[PDB]
Amino acid sequence: PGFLTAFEYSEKRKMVFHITTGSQEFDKLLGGGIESMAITEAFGEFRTGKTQLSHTLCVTAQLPGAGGYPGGKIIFIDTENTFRPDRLRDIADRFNVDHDAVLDNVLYARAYTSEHQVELLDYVAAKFHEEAGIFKLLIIDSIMALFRVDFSGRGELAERQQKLAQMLSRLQKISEEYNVAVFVTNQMGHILAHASTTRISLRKGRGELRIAKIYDSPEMPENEATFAITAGGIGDAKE
Amino acid sequence: PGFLTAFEYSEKRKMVFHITTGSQEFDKLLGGGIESMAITEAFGEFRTGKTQLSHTLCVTAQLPGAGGYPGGKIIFIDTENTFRPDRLRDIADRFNVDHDAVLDNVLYARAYTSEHQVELLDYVAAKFHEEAGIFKLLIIDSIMALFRVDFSGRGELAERQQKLAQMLSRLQKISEEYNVAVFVTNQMGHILAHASTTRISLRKGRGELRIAKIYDSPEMPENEATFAITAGGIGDAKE
Amino acid sequence: PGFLTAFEYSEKRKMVFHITTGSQEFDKLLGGGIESMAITEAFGEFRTGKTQLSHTLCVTAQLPGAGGYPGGKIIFIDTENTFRPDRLRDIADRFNVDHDAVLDNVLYARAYTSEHQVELLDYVAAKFHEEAGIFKLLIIDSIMALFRVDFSGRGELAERQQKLAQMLSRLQKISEEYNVAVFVTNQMGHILAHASTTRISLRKGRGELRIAKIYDSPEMPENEATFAITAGGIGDAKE
Amino acid sequence: PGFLTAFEYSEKRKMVFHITTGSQEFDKLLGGGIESMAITEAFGEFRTGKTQLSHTLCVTAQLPGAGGYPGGKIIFIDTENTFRPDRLRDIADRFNVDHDAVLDNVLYARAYTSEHQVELLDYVAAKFHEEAGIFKLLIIDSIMALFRVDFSGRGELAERQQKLAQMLSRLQKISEEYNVAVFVTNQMGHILAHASTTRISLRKGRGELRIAKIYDSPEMPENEATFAITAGGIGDAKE
Amino acid sequence: PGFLTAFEYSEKRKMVFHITTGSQEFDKLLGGGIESMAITEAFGEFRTGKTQLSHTLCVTAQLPGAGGYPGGKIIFIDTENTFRPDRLRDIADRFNVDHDAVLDNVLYARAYTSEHQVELLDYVAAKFHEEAGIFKLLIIDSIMALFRVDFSGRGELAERQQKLAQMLSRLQKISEEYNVAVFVTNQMGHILAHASTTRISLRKGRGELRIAKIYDSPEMPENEATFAITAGGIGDAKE
Amino acid sequence: PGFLTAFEYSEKRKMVFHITTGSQEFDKLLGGGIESMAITEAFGEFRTGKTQLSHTLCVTAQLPGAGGYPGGKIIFIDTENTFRPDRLRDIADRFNVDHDAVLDNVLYARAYTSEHQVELLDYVAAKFHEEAGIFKLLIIDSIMALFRVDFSGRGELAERQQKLAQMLSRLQKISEEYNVAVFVTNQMGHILAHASTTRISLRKGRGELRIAKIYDSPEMPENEATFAITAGGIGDAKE
Amino acid sequence: PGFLTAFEYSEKRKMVFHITTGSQEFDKLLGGGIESMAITEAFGEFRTGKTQLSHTLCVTAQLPGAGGYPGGKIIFIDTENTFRPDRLRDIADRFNVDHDAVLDNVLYARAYTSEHQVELLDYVAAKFHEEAGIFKLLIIDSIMALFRVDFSGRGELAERQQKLAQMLSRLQKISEEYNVAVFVTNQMGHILAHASTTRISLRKGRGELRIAKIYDSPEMPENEATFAITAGGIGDAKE
Amino acid sequence: PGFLTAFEYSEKRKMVFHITTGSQEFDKLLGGGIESMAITEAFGEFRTGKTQLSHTLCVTAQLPGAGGYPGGKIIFIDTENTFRPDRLRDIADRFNVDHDAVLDNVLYARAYTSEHQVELLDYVAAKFHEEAGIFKLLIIDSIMALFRVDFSGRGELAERQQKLAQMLSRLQKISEEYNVAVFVTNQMGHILAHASTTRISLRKGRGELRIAKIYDSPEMPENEATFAITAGGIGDAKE
């Protein structure tokens, strides 16, 4: 039928894996870090480590780990233009890994237009449909932002809201249908809310550290997370 | 005639069966819990047990109950993406039931667009029409939440409010015609008011317990109900 | 001609009968209760006995009485969905009458859409045109309410007001032309005013009793009415 | 020429006849009561005797009166649905007249839509044209009340205000052309102002008596009139 | 050419005559009373003698007088419906003149619609074009008033202003081209200002008398006029 | 080329002639009075002598004057309907001139619609083109006043303001091309500002005398002018 | 290519010359006075010498001077109509030059319509394209002003702003492409800002003198300029 | 695939070269000055050295520099019309460079309309595509300023804001694809924000020196930079 059974679904869910953040405490919040068949969001301040984490994950997501997770090829659609292979080859070190590999290991794609963006989304599917199980993370940073551009003033939001969810929906059907992990950043019942299943909010704790809280995500803990950042990606904050 | 006689109608109502909430003092508010041939609603806070209640009944309605109610299949349409089979196999225990069974006792289907959500409903009918007396519940959680989305800013409500009831009615016709019990959750003269024949508002009384009140329903008691939430779904709150 | 004479009309009016309410004092207000060739309205509070009275009348209207009134077959178009044959078979007792009969005696019809509603109205005529004098009461509860739904925001009332009176008028032509009694409930120079020839307003007098006053109806008495309600329909309040 | 001479016109006016109000001090305000070839209006409160006055004249205008006025047939168009023949046979007595007669002396016709109301008027002319000197009065109560209805909210008045006078003129042309006396009741530079040549405002002076004043009419007296209301219609108020 | 010379025009102006008002002092204001090739206006209070004067002039304008003025046939287009041949035959007495003549002497025309009105205006020309020098006064009372009717709310004045001046202009071309006297009444740089060449304003001076001032008219005197009114038209107020 | 040389232009300007105002101290403000090839305007109060000035010049411009100005025909376009030849024959005296002459020295033409007003102007050109050097003045009083009229409420100015200059330019082209002196009166960056090259504002200094000031014109003196008004038109104010 | 090199451009710029103002100090501000391949603007007060300077420049621009500038034929498109050959033949004296020459030396063109204006602009090019190096100054006074006319109220600025810059741009392509000097006057990031490369503002310093400051122009000095005006154009203010 | 690999991408970035600002403490803010494959912006006051900086770099980017940067051709698109080659030959000195060379090292092109400005950009690409590695910079000053112009009042921004990014993207694609360094100046979530990857805000610290800060850019230092402006372009500010 147009839909399956409960057992049959619980059959699928046995594939829900988590890509780590390198910040154990942080991972604890997401009960293991980034999740699959789910879009994770990055709420941040003008200067936030999200664009930093993205790189991290560009690699945590290549290192087999927790709950028998393999690791794999990733897709980094960049709108902002903050992608830094250099930052990558730098992280692959904290995890002692071949550089050319880590890079050979990610798939880069710069977004320019609110149309170009989905031009890519609808493509990503294709590369996911060809061969699956190779690609474990579809990281788009940032999604909105480029949409806050090709709008037609505070008067044509009617096209923005409509157009946005036109793919932000198509983005869900990728996540749970092809089974992957979609990390997304931005700065906003807001359409891009029920859309993203897990919403992480970020605040700075004085340069070194940062505090990641949950705005809204199934089984959301009231407690906060204390993670640190370095050249080697995101990591736990020590004494 | 395009309508029946009061007697003939009473004929149909002898089939009106209640599906336990799991919390006796809750079932009393509904005089037996969730009722058939009627859209019931879930009025809850940011963090409400409805999401849990929804699974619970994915079970309760399999356990023969009062009124000589056999127990049957179920159709769960998830908009919010919070259906956790893993939670079901967890409750069947408190009811000493086969795990694989219960999970075969449920039909899952994720809703993505305010159009997909109906694309489904217009199909839920068919499966129901194809064969009857098998499916005893059609639970849609949550129903509105997806419509708040696809809308065209607060300027095209005229399309959403019209589209909304365009299906909400379709829901009713199913409910009473095919005779089931449709449970629906949300957080909102409102079109989705006359829509759902019974409406339950839920408030949390300090973590462990919950207070489910009746917003507006036939023969509505002033008194409130006190139920608790546990892995084994919902149940009464003892000393 | 397109219209008759005065005598000739006074000829017709000799058929204006009243269906009782079981509440003598109440009946006194309506100078005999519900009238014919006239639409009666029910102004009420959130919790009003109108939906209660409706059932009562489902039977008072089958019991020959006052001013040589026979009694007969009724039509209960329900929008809200509060129809309870059970409440009927319960009232038929206060009047010592065959149950299966009372039920066999009413014609049920659930309204779903503002269109469905009139789909029914324009039908009712047909069943009235076929054979008359059998049907003495066309009870619609509630009329508006379902219309306050398929509207297009506070901006398209232009279709509501227009559509409403498009049939609320057609509802008059049924009442006086086919000679019957149309009881209607709702909660609002309002179009549905001159439309309904008799308007009764209802207030509660502490659980047991209720006070029915007149908002506007030919020969309207300033005094109030004190009626009580029980399983056996509406009745006079005793000491 | 498309208009006559002053002399020739004076020719027609020798026919201008007054139809008693029943209350001499009222007739004086109208110098003989209701006047021919002129639309007169009824300005009353929530509970006003106009409704009664309307019947009264259904009689008065059958009783030969001053100015050698014979007395004639009548056309009563009821929008408000308050025409009670039973009330007529009641007054003919105070005038010692055959009951069946009076009631054969009146032509009844209920108005339902703001369109039906004219559908009629455009026919009232015909019956008048067919044969003349027979019908001495065309009473329409009330006229506006039905137009307030079919309108499209306060946003389409432009259609009602235009439609309104589209007939109100038709009324005038009848009045003066066919020579009758058209009486009309209501509760409102107003289009229905220049429309009705005479306007009477009525106020109740403690139940029994009533004060009918002149809002605006040719040769209008400051003094007021004091008439009483009784089963025998309207009449003077004695000591 | 499309226009003449000055001498040639001064040739025409030797025909500018004045129809009296019977109120010498008043006539002094208008330097002889009503003028020709000029539209005179009547500014008044709710109860003003304008509709009274009109009748007067219906006759002053038949009595040869001042500046070798003959007298003649008149046209009284009435919108309001206050025309009273009876009042005429009454004035013809103050001037000792055959009654049937005075009447035989005026041409009556009732205006009903803002269209009907000009239907008449454009006709009047025709009767003026056929034979001239017979008709010395075209009296329209009141002009506006009927226009304040067929408007489409305070929103379609765009048709009123435009339509009004569409003929109020055509009214000028009658006045100066056919050489006559156009007296007009109403109650309002207002379009109907530059339009009417002479504007008289009226105020009451305690029942009997009235004070006529000039709002704006070539060579307008600051002083006021004191005229009286009786059955015999307007006349000078004595000691 | 579609424009001439400065020398060639100076050629034309040697013809620029002034037409006396009649009041020497007024002529000085205009350095000789009304000037050729330039639209001059009349800024006056409710009661201003412009209307008089207009006639005056209908003469002055026939009386050979300074600058060896011969004197010529004239075209008077009256919107306001205040042209009184009788006034002209009155002034020619103060200038000892043939009456019949002066009045043959003027061309009259009444303007009715804002369209007629131009219908004319577009003809004034022709008569001018047909033969030249004959007409030395084109006086239009008043020009705006007629446009305030035909407009569509303050909501269609966009048509009037556009239509306005659509002719006002046509006026200019005449002025300078055909070389005349166009005088225009009114009571209003304003389109009719750059329009008229010279603008004169007039104020009355206690009946007898008048103060004409310059609102805005080439080489404008601060000092004011004091002229008097008399039957003999305008002239200086002696001791 | 569609554009040249830097050297190649610096090749052209060796033709940038300045037409003097006769006011050395003023010329110092513009580093030599009016510049070429650049539109200069005149910001002024109600009574400003701009229309005075224009004439001056009509001649300074014919007198070989500074930085080996020849002198030449000019184009004076006048909208306002303040052109005075007389003022010219007067200035040619301060510079001891043949009169008929100075005049024979300028090309006059009066602007009437916002369309006529550009009709001319697009023409000027043509006369510049035929033969160049003869015409050194295209003086338009004033540009805007006539545009503030053919607008369609404060609502159609959408055509004004658009239309204005449609040629004000075409005006740049004349200036730098054909190498000339365009002086423009008016009284207003305003479109006509970046448009005009040099903006001079003018204030009066008590009749005789005037102070010219810079609103915005490359290398704009904070200091002010003190120039005087006489019949002989603009000149330096002495002791 | 329509996008490359992270490794392959790192391949391209090894080419990212910085082009000196001339002020070492300025270059540090940009870690080497203006950066390749990125739109940098100039945030300045009314009087800012950007205009100068723009020329400077017309040189700097010809002088072999750090990162073994050779030095190349340049494309200068001037909207503001302030490009002064004369200024270039002036700086090459401080860098001991051939004058004719430098000026052959630059490609000039003036932008007139918001359409011309792109007409160009869409060509800048071609020349770039035709042959590569030759042009090392595409400087457009200023970019927005021309768009503020052609717009349709604040009511058609919807066209400008859309048109704006319609090219601003085109700019980006060039930048990173053809690998250059595009510098752009202006005075304004803003579409031209995500547009330019780096943004520099400039403030003047008392004539001689200037403070260039970073509004928002990757790895942005809090500290500010202090550079001076001189004929020799921009450079450091010594004791």
From Swiss-Prot, chains A, B, C, D, E, F, G, H:
The keyword DNA-binding applies. SsDNA binds at R148, F151, R154, R160, R210. One of its GO terms (cellular component) is site of double-strand break. Its main location: nucleus. It is found in: Nucleus; Chromosome. Changing F151A: Abolishes binding to ssDNA. Changing R154A: Abolishes binding to ssDNA or dsDNA. Changing R160A: Abolishes binding to ssDNA or dsDNA. The keyword Protein transport does not apply. ATP binds at G44, E45, F46, R47, T48, G49, K50, T51. Keywords: ATP-binding, Cell cycle, Chromosome, DNA-binding, Meiosis, Nucleotide-binding, Nucleus. GO terms for biological process: chromosome organization involved in meiotic cell cycle; DNA recombinase assembly; DNA strand invasion; double-strand break repair involved in meiotic recombination; female gamete generation; homologous chromosome pairing at meiosis; male meiosis I; meiotic cell cycle. DsDNA binds at R148, R154, R160. GO terms for molecular function: ATP binding; ATP hydrolysis activity; ATP-dependent activity, acting on DNA; ATP-dependent DNA damage sensor activity; DNA binding; DNA strand exchange activity; double-stranded DNA binding; identical protein binding. Participates in meiotic recombination, specifically in homologous strand assimilation, which is required for the resolution of meiotic double-strand breaks. Double stacked ring-shaped homooctamer. Interacts with BRCA2. Interacts with the MND1-PSMC3IP heterodimer. Interacts with RAD51AP1; the interaction is direct and stimulates DMC1-mediated homologous recombination. Belongs to the RecA family. DMC1 subfamily. This is Meiotic recombination protein DMC1/LIM15 homolog. The gene is DMC1.
